[PDB]
Ligand binder design. Structure first.
Ligand SMILES: Cc1cc(CO)c2cccc(CC(=O)N3CC[C@@H](CN)C3)c2n1
Lengths: 39, 156
């Protein structure tokens, strides 16, 4: 049995840890809602 | 139960200790998460009950108490913030420029930020603080690193 606890407000935070890249990926989405790479 | 807007941990006790299986967003009295987190099961909010209302395994989305409310969209240009809520760790904004999932049915935002599976459901925000989608459905790439879709639902 599953329960929820509040974790914060939903706010844009000016001066937050900027990171990660921006890949363009060829993908397929199956009937189970699973993504996969089309190569 | 607690119907205050904001982001929430999704917990279970069905394993050793209290385990965080995912995250979700409360807006307009409706709780939004990813299908693979709850499997469409009901939720406790103190001693209030949340019953599923809408869901779709293919979109990997589920809403509780009401229809899907989150209609904001990535603009295709601006950076975004993942409001990550990892297991045992405080809420943390992580700003990023999304990549792109190219599919036969169209193009989708993707964010390349690796975090544990229990982070599934954390919202991704625009500059005005609107939820443009949820983190936690994606793919492991050439590198072995994780990339998530910006998964958004349709509003009616
Ligand atoms: C293997 C892995 C690794 C990482 C990061 O290291 C993940 C981060 C967030 C979320 C998931 C889970 C995930 O993408 N799905 C499970 C179910 C499926 C169908 N919706 C999609 C991660 N799965």
């Amino acid at each position: 049995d599953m329960y929820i606890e509040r974790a914060g407000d939903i706010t844009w935070e000016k001066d937050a840890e900027v990171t990660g890249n921006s890949p363009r990926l060829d993908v397929a989405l199956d009937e189970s809602g699973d993504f996969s790479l089309v190569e | 139960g607690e119907t205050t807007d904001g982001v929430y941990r999704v917990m279970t006790r069905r394993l050793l200790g209290s385990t965080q299986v995912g995250v979700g967003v409360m807006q307009e009295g409706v709780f939004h998460t990813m299908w693979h987190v709850t499997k469409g099961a009901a939720l406790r909010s103190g001693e209030g009950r949340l019953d599923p209302y809408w869901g779709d395994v293919k979109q990997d989305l589920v809403s509780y108490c009401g229809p899907w409310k989150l209609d904001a969209a990535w603009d295709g240009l601006s950076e975004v913030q993942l409001l990550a809520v990892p297991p045992g760790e405080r809420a943390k904004n992580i700003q990023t420029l999304p990549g792109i999932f190219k599919t036969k049915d169209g193009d989708i935002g993707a964010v390349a930020l690796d975090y544990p599976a229990g982070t599934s459901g954390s919202p991704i925000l625009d500059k005005c603080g609107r939820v443009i989608g949820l983190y936690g459905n994606g793919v492991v790439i050439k590198n072995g690193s994780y990339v998530s879709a910006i998964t958004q639902g349709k509003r009616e």
